[PDB]
Design a protein around this ligand. Structure first.
Ligand SMILES: [Ca+2]
Ligand code: NI
Length: 153
């Protein structure tokens, strides 16, 4: 009612269909009056891997400190349209809190261990058009309560 006032905006920094990396950019805004503990916030980006390989996420920049933002990869089960995996982004306790009426960006990249290609065009979360942050319901966010933003595939 006031405990999940996290607005999520998104765009892709690189929008090549055949791409050796995926470039998720999130902007998270606390739209309410109470602080949000980032350690409990998770984000998902859903995609089809187009050849499974070890993958790595890097956070290149966030005001909370990029080393405090990490990513892991999980398989969808069952797979569905546009989604056989998701990236899950998490924040450490050192990321701190997101104050009332403030926002942070989370900018990063992921790639396969052998740098082989993805097809971005079929990915559930991919936005082929946005060049700026946009309120995007095809990425999801979570608190300790579970889902707080978006539509899971
Ligand atoms: Ca794909
Ligand atoms: Ni609430």
């Amino acid at each position: 009612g006031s405990h999940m006032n996290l607005k999520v905006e998104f765009f892709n920094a690189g929008t090549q269909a055949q791409s050796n990396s995926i470039y998720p950019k999130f902007r998270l805004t606390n739209t309410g009056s109470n602080a949000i503990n980032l350690a409990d916030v998770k984000l998902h980006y859903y995609f089809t891997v187009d050849g499974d390989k070890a993958q790595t996420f890097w956070c290149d920049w966030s005001p909370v400190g990029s080393s405090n933002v990490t990513g892991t990869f999980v398989k969808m089960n069952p797979t569905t349209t546009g989604a056989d995996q998701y990236l899950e982004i998490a924040f450490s306790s050192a990321a701190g809190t997101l104050a009332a009426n403030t926002s942070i960006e989370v900018q990063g990249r992921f790639a396969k261990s052998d740098w082989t290609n993805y097809n971005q065009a079929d990915d559930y979360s991919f936005n082929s058009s946005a060049t700026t942050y946009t309120s995007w319901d095809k990425v999801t966010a979570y608190s300790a309560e579970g889902l707080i933003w978006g539509i899971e595939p």
